[PDB]
Structures are given as structure tokens and as C-alpha cells.
Scaffold this active site. Sequence first.
Site, PDB file in Angstrom:
ATOM      1  N   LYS C 154       0.883  -1.373  -0.155  1.00  0.00           N
ATOM      2  CA  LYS C 154       0.092  -0.048   0.091  1.00  0.00           C
ATOM      3  C   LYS C 154       0.888   0.972   0.053  1.00  0.00           C
ATOM      4  N   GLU C 180       2.042   3.716  12.191  1.00  0.00           N
ATOM      5  CA  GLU C 180       2.687   3.250  10.836  1.00  0.00           C
ATOM      6  C   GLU C 180       3.889   2.609  11.650  1.00  0.00           C
ATOM      7  N   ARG C 181       4.367   1.570  10.845  1.00  0.00           N
ATOM      8  CA  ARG C 181       5.365   0.609  11.620  1.00  0.00           C
ATOM      9  C   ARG C 181       6.604   1.113  11.303  1.00  0.00           C
TER      10      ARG C 181
END
Lengths: 487, 66, 467, 466, 58, 167
Positions: C154, C180-181
Site C-alpha cells: 500500500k 505506521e510501522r
Amino acid sequence: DLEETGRVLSIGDGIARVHGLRNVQAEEMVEFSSGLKGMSLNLEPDNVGVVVFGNDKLIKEGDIVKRTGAIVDVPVGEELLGRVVDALGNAIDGKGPIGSKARRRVGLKAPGIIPRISVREPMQTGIKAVDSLVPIGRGQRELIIGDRQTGKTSIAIDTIINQKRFNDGTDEKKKLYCIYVAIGQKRSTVAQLVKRLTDADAMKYTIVVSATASDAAPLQYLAPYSGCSMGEYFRDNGKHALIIYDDLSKQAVAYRQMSLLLRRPPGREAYPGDVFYLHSRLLERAAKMNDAFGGGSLTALPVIETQAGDVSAYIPTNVISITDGQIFLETELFYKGIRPAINVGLSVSRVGSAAQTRAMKQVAGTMKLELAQYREVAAFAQFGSDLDAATQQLLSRGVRLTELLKQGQYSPMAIEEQVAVIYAGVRGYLDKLEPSKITKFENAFLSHVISQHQALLGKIRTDGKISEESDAKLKEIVTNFLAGFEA
Amino acid sequence: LDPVQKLFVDKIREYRTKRQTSGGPVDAGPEYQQDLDRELFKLKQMYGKADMNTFPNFTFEDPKFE
Amino acid sequence: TTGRIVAVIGAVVDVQFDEGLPPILNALEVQGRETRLVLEVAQHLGESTVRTIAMDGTEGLVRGQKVLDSGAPIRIPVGPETLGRIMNVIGEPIDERGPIKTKQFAAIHAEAPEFVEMSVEQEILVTGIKVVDLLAPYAKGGKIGLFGGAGVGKTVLIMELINNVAKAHGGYSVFAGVGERTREGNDLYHEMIESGVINLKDATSKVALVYGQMNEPPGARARVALTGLTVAEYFRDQEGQDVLLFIDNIFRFTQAGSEVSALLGRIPSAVGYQPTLATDMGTMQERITTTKKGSITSVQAIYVPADDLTDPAPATTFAHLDATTVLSRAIAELGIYPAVDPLDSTSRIMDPNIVGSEHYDVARGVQKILQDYKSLQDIIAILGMDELSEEDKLTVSRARKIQRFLSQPFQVAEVFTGHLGKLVPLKETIKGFQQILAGEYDHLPEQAFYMVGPIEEAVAKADKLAE
Amino acid sequence: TTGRIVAVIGAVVDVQFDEGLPPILNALEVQGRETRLVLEVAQHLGESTVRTIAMDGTEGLVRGQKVLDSGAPIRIPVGPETLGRIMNVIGEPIDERGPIKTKQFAAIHAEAPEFVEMSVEQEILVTGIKVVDLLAPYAKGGKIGLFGGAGVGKTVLIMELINNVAKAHGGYSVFAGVGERTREGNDLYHEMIESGVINLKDATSKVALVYGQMNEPPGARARVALTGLTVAEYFRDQEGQDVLLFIDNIFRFTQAGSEVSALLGRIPSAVGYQPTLATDMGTMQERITTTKKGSITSVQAIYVPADDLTDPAPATTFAHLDATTVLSRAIAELGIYPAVDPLDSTSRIMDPNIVGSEHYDVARGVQKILQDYKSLQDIIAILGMDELSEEDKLTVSRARKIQRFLSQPFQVAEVFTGHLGKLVPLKETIKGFQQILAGEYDHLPEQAFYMVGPIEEAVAKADKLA
Amino acid sequence: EVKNRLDYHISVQNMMRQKEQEHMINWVEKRVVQSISAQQEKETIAKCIADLKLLSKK
Amino acid sequence: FAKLVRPPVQIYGIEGRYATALYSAASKQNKLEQVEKELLRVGQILKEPKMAASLLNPYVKRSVKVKSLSDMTAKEKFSPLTSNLINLLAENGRLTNTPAVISAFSTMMSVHRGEVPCTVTTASALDETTLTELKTVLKSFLSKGQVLKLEVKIDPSIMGGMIVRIG
């Protein structure tokens, strides 16, 4: 002393409104009249909502609440490797006092950016389907999804067992500490399970954190966090730790429950919302770190066992949004006998290539495709019956590969072997064979390559890649050996 | 084995008060004896059964040939 | 002013202040707080107790712990040095590269520009991606939503866009990675660095990075939104600058809001939400745009849980949008990349006028065919290469090619794919599909258009596919 | 210690004992309640008030009335003198042969034995049912949970199981009628009288009945589970025995818990549940098992609420299950008995090796065959047949036999069946279906496999026809 | 087949020593602890440690 | 607005939000102890049973809450500018909640400039100081005889249960 002591303001249901301790550190592990710990989770001004860690039938009211004055730590070590403990580090195995008597805060925060490093290590599971179709890296957090014992666990087992050899290998890049956080997996489940790991004594580099069905909920909740500090530890100590959280699904159940009993909410699906966060914070702590951190890793294999494939299911959606894929295991296939039972369409690793040997990559790349295409003519026109002749062959190819990606009930492998059979099919020497016998071909084939081509394999094993030697030999082997397998 | 000397005087001498007798180690305790006899037989049942103070020597065999 | 933490019930920290009670939103500095635990006054709860939000995590806060009010909202380092740097919510770095010493500090509230500051009619930002521009003829400085899960890369997609454009771009960028990672941000970090889009020789690499990840507690995540916001306003308004504002992912901000609503005293609305979801975005969203002071092209990665959209939140979002990307997983699943939900990835600003009819119409034909095609598709999903007529076959097949022409590979995730991607300037495209509309050659297989550059490349690929 | 009835809201008895507050779980006996009104303390609410649960009637409870703490949690007689006795929850008869008197009493809430004396592994018990043994090879001493709809022949089945098993049994058996119908217990009573293995020359019968019927208030129903456990743990561990513990129906227990949850002031979780539902599971379930101290073969009738299994309650349950027994109402509806949903019924020891993998494999082909066949059903549902594929056409038919072949009438319930039922040992089973796999019958009447035991007889059943 | 033997005998004595140890612990503690309390000087020791609180609490 | 005052006791919320008002309202003007010993006499001339239900009748009907101490103890000078807050309490139905206001007020009102503890195995160690464990050593100077093993007991427990707890 009894002055930063408190009287149980009210209790029942393990929800202790706690009188006193009015200087309490947030999330202080507290110390009981019943000895016990509790968590002063909730600082209300007029009480301390204390989650009681463990049984409260013992308990009665006005009872003295003592600080432990400690924010929880858990004992930490590698002396958890070869230990079944509960999360506080309590041998339930009856293996006696752990060597892990260093302690470490169970909350220790997740890495920095620079501290982290991307993955590029593979890793493996001994499962062709897996290593091929979901090639494994190190430092993960990615979803394992499937339903229960089917040997749900088998899947994990073959992996753990697979790391045995790797633990018989070297580096934290072969050797791996396996951490099995068992969340809510009954004594039996475990009893059995442990019994297995032990038998495989893959247990040796392995923690089994055992939170059985009986256990109190926060404990079970905690069990992973407990593990979490320990795995980060390993990570930061270069060690590559593998945690299988099986499962957070249950964890949530507890966590909410706990919340609810604290009246602390029941968000969507009855779970309050920061259970995502819960895990996010938990799981970010699983990473593959840079070398300053020994390069280590904490590879996270979270597990969610789905009720009826319910995944838009809150925690699953959540989890999906953290995880970088999900490995869907598919039941129909199971019933078909196809165990592993996968749906790899619903298994994804965005990651893909960081997670694998070249060896496999070379044979597998195409294979994925060959099946994909195979599936497709089952699908555009939702009939397994065909749409083109070409494909009447290709379908054969697909079908062959199908036989191959299976994995024996209670069986792992290693990559060159895995590639061995895979090459055979990919480069096709066994569509000139009936699909059921492909696996059969392997038994012999494998025992042959093991025998002979451990040499050759010696090379493939060496290269992490199929080499000209190997290949040249292979082309020949496969043909010849196959020829021998048949005739 | 462990500590505090006034309390442990009460207990640590009571470790070995038990051991400081050995025909009923200041108490073998009839209950201990009874449940012991229960578990020792029951243990035996839970065990394999081929007497534990005997050597299981060998056996011989002859396999299918046509 | 002074308060004591009187109750900490989660990161809603109730601090009772002696008297000394400052406005809502006010940043309080918790004293004795191991770190700067800024509390944002959330409520004046009454009786000089505020419900505040910790943006940090609690861990050992002594009951009573002292707070000395920072007395206004969070003012944070801003200024250009945040460009080429990763700032956390509190305007401080997390690049871990010294400080991001500003001059300017900012309360990370800011607001909606006035009507007069509005520029009434916007102008296309092109992407050079066929499908993208076409269906969404993006607008310079607008609100772009990317509804999208993860999965597809994504992030990869957004990044890739960033790569093509934000690089190419003249102005600045602000990136707020919300929820968000950290890991991806890590990889990305190294990448940005790698790319020099974070040059580490430029704190004006072109981009200020704002990260407020998932492992953050809501208070951090929620507010990272403001952080990013405040910063971009600096570059647009202050710096004139055509700012790009990358958000991954606004949903998680919002979500952070919904997640909180409960503790926040706000009813879990429909879907659990914050019932204030709308303002939460809205007033906020209104803070980001093209005014006459420049453009903030507001690019929002939007998780839509399980990508449901009928869920109010996206419903609202559209209102703010001006370009929508609903990426269709089906398309992704078809391996088609662009994996867009094409007939749900738009930019409203489509016209035979504006986008030229050539395009426009082609699109109208296209949208149409797809709509139709689908209809016949409805037959095929279970009923294949003949339940039906064969003029219809042409159109069907044409679609199968067209589809493949929709596929543009990735110029970054060539690593996984092996596919170099292409970026396809518009004319070659429009004309390209228009040729397909002209139905060029077709003895051919239908993958001939798959993951190539412009249509020629499909041709190029075609000859090649005939070996 | 004494309490005052401070609030009675039904059998949730809010008691203030101001005479200190004995344990949470301290069992109370109500004063002014000649009829032994047990309340168990649930909460120390504060205010020297406990929320306690009456399990029973709340007649004449003046608010203030004296309640006298029983000074321990609930304790019950346990002793061999219970077998052949229908004991209620309260350790008392409902055998009505006078009091079920025992030597020892036991507090009924207890520990879940530690992992290490728990035998870590088990062995498939044979039920005498093809379908069972083959498909879900349940384990001796395991917890087998009978998911099954309302009266879905389950009740019939369990009885039949009793029939098949309890007889043969070497150890003894317990029936814990949790929310059982007084009637069924009756039925059972007579069946047992009848069976004479509730021999009354035995209060040491082959089976002990503990009943905690529906008509009881939930607290009782809630508690009968613990009670029964306590006795049986005593027979297993204490009396060494391989206990078969028939519980019908734990759901009703669960329900009893849930039922209280609300007016335990609690949030009663989803659908009303308990948040603690799970811990509830651990807390009983983990207590019952197979140790080295014997086996408690644990037969749990599990009402599957609305046959909703996704239903968290059952959702949980599977986890606890050594053997999950899913009765297929769907199948049942086909009139079929064995009515199982065996593609839902499992045994973890259904996994090759363990059970003789052939045995299993023979099953794997079937399991498959049926499953694929199941797959087809949407297609077929409209489409019927004639553009599909032949092999499938064969399977269809074969499946159709297989389907029938699982069916077996009721041996006991010839009253129900008319039929004599059947019983099948392994070989005919393994072979039976395997034979079908050999498709030896594919010109033999398909339905003829219906309501049979041995495939032979089934073959015969095809034959008389042709 | 031999060894299980030997191992039982050991395991018995190990288990037997623990079931002594538990019966010992309960009985030993239940015998020699009841009488102790004649020490008012266990509260002079309460006193003693309490002066080592009242003092040694600085 | 007002200004927060608290001389020890001190509850915060549920009467404790209330007590902390008259706590600054009585302590301002310092009619506090004059109103303590007021409120103390009133604690029992209220609580009674010539009235069980005629100075704390809440209802049989409302009329009591119109005034019955706005009028029966504004029939007393007792409480003469703190009898306004009892009239609030009389209307506002909390008239049975006064025992914890006065307990808060008086364990407030003594211990209002004082310190109570109770350590381990003492129990009447429950007093009103300005310094500690110099004072509770002064309670071990009642005689160190009689203490730290009774009332509440080092016998089973502290000491006696701790050696059981190692196991």
C-alpha cells in the site's frame, strides 16, 4: 511497616478497589496480603483499581494492600531456553528455579528507526509450502492464521523443530531462540505440546511460556509482554528470537474482560480499542535490529486462530493492518486431506524475497505462478474443468506442484532438500508421473538425494542457491533418479 | 538450609529433628505411611510392571521368509 | 500553573490543578515526569481538574505527581530543519541526529483558511500514471485520499508515488507517518537517505518527516497529525512552497480518535467512533489545502478497516476529498498493478474541458465499458470462454487487454517483482488505450499490455511475446 | 458469622454480614431458613456486604434476616455411597433412598491439578460407533464435548453411549445432570433401575447421578458442575477410577453463570455472557482430565446455543476439547443417525500415526470425498447434475452411500427407531467405507447404507433390493 | 525395559522424600510452632526490630 | 470560584468534594472547630431516634425537604452559617450521608492537624501527630510490653506465615 500499605477498599471479582497506597507508581505491581501481585492499573483518586493477579477467593476486604512498589519485570535469560514457565517465570514443568533470575521490565519499548534494520535474512520452517510460498525472514511480526488443532500447532512445530538443526547450526541467524508464548492453551494442550517439543528437544533454545486455559486473564494477557521483554533482549543481544504468540485472540478476550471488570470499556466487538495499540506497542518490540543491537531479532509470529475465518473481525483487521501479511491456512483442503491446508492467496508476505534463499527463489518463483495460473482456469469460469488444451498440460503441472507443497503431518525439512524436490517438479520430471505419487517419489527421492546428493546438496547448501554444479547434477539427477524412481 | 535463627531454630532443628530420628523420623506419620503405600502401589500401576528389582534379559525372534 | 496528577486512568490523566487551570489543548508539562510528558488539556473537567491526555505512556507515575503546566498548547520546534529530519510529534527529532533546532515554535493547532483564501478552481497535478491521472486527474494542492489497506504494497504504492513525484517535484514535502510501522519507516528511512530524498546533507532534503507510529499511544498519534499539519503550513504559507503532505495513515489518527472516544467521554458512535470524528478530521482537514498562499497537497493514506467505506468515516472523508483512491483489492488480486479501484479512484476534476475530452471521453467510454464489461463479467466468473456471443467476445477480450494495459509496473518494487516499472506520460497513454479502443491487433494474447510503459511498450512487449 | 438479608433481588442475595466477611466463596446457611438455603459469597462488596448467591428459593426472606455463615465454602459429602444415588447438587439425595451419606465432605471449588501428574497424552477410546471412532477418535479420559442441538437425538445418543460404554466400563461413571430435565433423569432413572447397573444393592452403583436440574435456580445449576467434579475427582484420583463423567449439559451451567452475571451487577458479556466466561472454563475444565491418578472421561453435553457455535461460548469450547463432538443438525434433519457433523467433530488424535494412519487414511479419502462433494453443493443446488463431471458423479453416489453408511439405527432406542440399531467394530468400519472407496457398490442401491452398522449388513441391505 | 525399574525405585524415594517433606513440613510446623508463643520476648523481638524500625527507619 | 484548602482529612469526591468546600469555608473565618464541636454535638442530637424519622425523616411525604432543619436545628443556633449547608443537605436528600461528612470532618477535625498510622502487628496505633516513628516508639514507651504481637498479632502471620510461605 504498614503505612504505604492500604486496606482493600472493595473486592470481589478480583477487582480491587484499593484503599490506600496513595503514592503508588502507575502500573505498580503491588504486593498482597495474599502475597500476590496486582497491578495498580487504575489510579482513581479515591482508590486504586487494582487488577488482581491471580485468584481472589482467598481474598477478603480491607485486606492489606502493600506496595510491591515495582513496575513489573519478569526474570530474563536464556535459561528460559529449555524451560516451561508461567510468565512470572514459574516452572510449572517442575523443572525448578530457572537460570533466568536477571529481570527485565516487561514493557521495554520498541526500537528506533536507525536502531532497526530491515530484514534480509531469510529463515525457514522446514515446510516446503512455507519456505517456498512464504519464504521466512527474521525479526518478523506477521500473521499466522488458521484454526486450531489440526495440528494447527503442527505448523509451528515443524518450524520449531526445523530450527533445531539451525540451533544445531550457528549464529542467531541459524540458531534461533524459540519462544512460544502459549496464551490460554490448556494444561493438556500444552501438556501435550511441551511433551512434543521436549521430544524434539528443539525445546533447548526455546522458551515455552505456558499460559493454560485455567490461568487468570491478566496473566495470560501479560504472558506475551513478559515474553516481549525477553525477546527484545535476545534481539538486542543479537539473538534472534522467535515468538509465537498463540494467541492474542484469547489475549484480547482476557484483556477486555479485565477492562470490563474494571468497567474499562468494551469497544467494537466488546473489546476496548487500544488492544490494537496493545499489541502494536508489543509487536513493534519485535523487529530485526541493527548490529548495535547485536543485529538481533525478535521475530514475531503472532497467531490468530480464527472463528470461522472472521478477519474483518476487529482484532484481525487490526492485526492485518500491523502485519505484513497473514498466512491463511485453508480448511477445505484440510478435509481433502490437504494438510497443510493453506490458501496462499490468502497467505501473503509483502516481504517476499528478503525472506529466502536463492535456491528456492529460482524454482519457486515460477511455481507460484504455475499454480496461480492453474488456479485461474479452475476460476475464470468457476470450474475445475478446463478452458484451453495448453493448460490441460499446465493444469497437470499445477496439480503436480500441488502434491509437492504439502507437508507431512509432523515433519519439517531444510532448504536444499526442499529445493531438491521442488526443482524436480518445477523443472518437471514428474508430470510424467501421476500427482499422488509425487510425494511418494519424494520419499524415495529424498532418501536418495540425502544419500547421494548430500554431496551435491553440499553444494546447494553451500550456495544458498542452486549452482551450476548442483543444477547440472540436478538436471541429470532428477531425470535419472526420477527415471530410477519410476523405472 | 535457609535462615532466620530464632524462627529457624524452631524449624531448622525441625528439619533435622525429623532426620534426628529415622524409625518414624520424629514422625514418619501414619498418614504419610498410608498414602505412601497408596501412591507406591499406584505409582507401580502407573509404571511399567516387569519387577523393578529384576533384570529383563533378552528375547529371540525369527522373521518372515517365503 | 500547578497540578497533581490526581487520577491516572490510562493516558487520560486527570490532573487537578490547584487553581491555575489553563485553556483546553494546553500543554502541561508533567514534572517529575521522566520524560517530557506533555499533557494536552482535554477538558476542564470542572473543579480545576482537567482531563488531559498523555501522549506518552504512564508507567510509574506516583499518585499526586506534579505537573507544572506548559500553559498553552504544544509548541514545538518547527522551521526548515524539520525538513530532511524526522520529528516526532513534539517537534523534536526521532531521527536521532541531534536536535531539529528551530527558531519558530508552533502550537500545533492552526486552522482552516478563509473563503477568500480559498482558491476556487484547481488544476491537475499529473502523476504520469495512466490509470492514476486518468481516473483521478489529481489536483495540485488538494486533498487526496488513498483508501487502501496495506498488503498491496500500500505503502509501496504511496511511496512509489512519492518516489516518482515528490522527487520530481519542485516544492517540499511533509510526511507524517501516523500509526505506521516504525520498521517500515526504518527501511524507508534508510531508503530516503539512500535516495537522498532525505539527503543527510540537507535538512531541506525536500522533506520533513514527522513520524507518530503505531507503538505510540494515541495521544502521540493523534497529535502527530497536528504536528505534521503545523509544519506544512509553515512551508506553504510561510515558505510559499508547494508542499506535499504525505500521511500514512490518517485513518489511524482518526482511529486513534475513535479508540479514545470512550475515555474521552465521547460516545463510541456509529462504529464505535468519536462522534466528533467529523470535526476531528474536518476542522483539521480544513487546515490543509491550496490557498492562495500555495498548495498543500494533502495525500492521505486511509485505512478503511477491511477497507469498508460505508463506514461513516470514509463517507465523511470524501467530503474533504477532491481526489479519492479507493484501491480495489480485486484489481490487486488480479495482480493488476495499478491495483486501483478504478471506478472508485477519481479526482472529481475530470472534464472534456479540463481534462480534455480526449481523455475524458476516453474515460467515459472506459468507465462505461468497464461497467458493462463487468456485466458480462458477471456471466464469466463462473461461466468462462463462452456462455455467450462473440462481438461481445471482442469487447471482453479487449477488456482483458485493457486490463493488462492498466497494469504499469513498479519502479521500486522491482525487487520483488523483477518488474521495472514504468511511468507513462499522459499522451502516450490516452492515445494508447484509444488504440485499444481502436482494437489494434488481437490474434495476440491479452497480456501484451501487461506492466509495460506506454502502449508502444505493449507493442514492444507484444513482438517479444511472440517470442 | 451472621448476615442480614439486606437485599434480595431474587436468589442474588445481597447479604450484609457485619460479623466480618468470610471468604469470597464462603458458603453461607441462612438462618430463618430452615430449608437449607445456601448462599455462596461472590463479592465482598464492601460495607460488610457481600453479594452472595442463593442457589435456591427466596421465600420469607425478611430484609435483615439472619444468615449464618457455614464457615467454609461449599462442602459436600463425597464417598462411594453416592453411586446409584441421585444426588443433587447439595450432596443430598434425589435418589430419595435417604441421605447420600459419606465419610468425607469436600469443598467443591478446587484447584485444577498440576501439569506434571497430568498425563500429557492419551489414547483413543472406542465408542462402538463407526462414525465416531473413525472420524473423531476420542480419547479415554478426555473431555469430549457434545455439541448438539436441542434434544437432537443427542440425549438419545448419550444414553446410547452410556449404553455402549458404561456397561463395559471398568471404572465407574458419573452423570451430572446439569440443567437436566427432571424427566430425563427420570427416564434415566428408570433406565438405570432397569439397567440395574444402577443396582440398588449398590449405593456403589456403576454410575453415580448428581443432578442439578433446570428447575433449580442457576446458582444451583452453576454449582452442580463443581459439586460433581469434586466427587469425581475423588473417584478418579482418590478412588483411582477411570471415571466416566457424563455431564449433560454444561451449557446449562454456563448459562447459569451468565444468567447471574447481570445481576452480579456485571456486564454480562457478549449477548449477555460473562467476561469471565473463559476463566469459568478453565476453572472447571482444567480440573477435569486424565491424570496419572486415573481418568475422568469427560462427556460434556454442550448445548450449542441456537446451534450457534461461532457463538463465543462454543467458540471457546473447542479449545478445551480433546474431542469435540459436533452433532450435525443438518444431517440429523436428514433423519440420519449417526447425525454427526464429523467434519466438525474432531479429535486431535485424529492425526495419522496415532490411530493407525491407515485407519485414518481410509478416513482421509472419505473425508475428502465428502468434503469435495460438500463443495459441490452450491453448484448442485441449482445445477443438479448434467454439465458437471463424472468422477464427481461417482463420488456423489459414493458419498451418498457413505453418508448412508454412517447411519446406524438405535439399539437402545428401538423405541425411537423401531429398528434395531447396530453396533460396528473397527474392521467393518475401516473396511466399510474403504470398500466404498473401492466402489464396490456402484450398482448396489445407494441409500441402503442407511441405518446400518456393519457394511456387510449394509451390503445385504442393498441386496435384498438388488 | 530394564531401566524403568531402577528409575521407579528412585522416583519413589524422591516422591517419598517429598511426601515426607510435606508431612514433615505440616506436622513439624504444626507441632513445634504452637508452644513457642510463651515468648513475650518474640514481641521483645518485635520490640527489638521495632526499635530497629523506630530508629532504623531514618 | 473558591480556594482549595484540606487540614488533614481529606477524602476528595462523594462528600469529600463537599467537606473540602466547608473545609475552605469554615477554615476561612476559622469557625472550623467551633463548627466541628458544633457538628459533633449535632452528630448525635441528629442521629436519634426520638426521631428515627423526625430529624432525619426524609419522606413519608416531602415537607421535611421543604424545611425540617432549615426549621428543626435552624431551631437550634447550632449551625448559624453552616446550617445553610445542612438545609442544602436536607433538601438535596443526602441527609443520611452527613455521618461520613462529620467523620470526614472530625477524623478531619482532630487528626485535622494530625497523623494516624498503624504498622504491622499493632492496631490501636492510631493517633494525631506532626512527626512519626519517634512517636510510635513513644507507643512502644507506653510499655514495649503489650505491643507488636497483639491486638493484631505476629503470631500466625508476619513471622509465622512467612516460613510457611517459602514452602
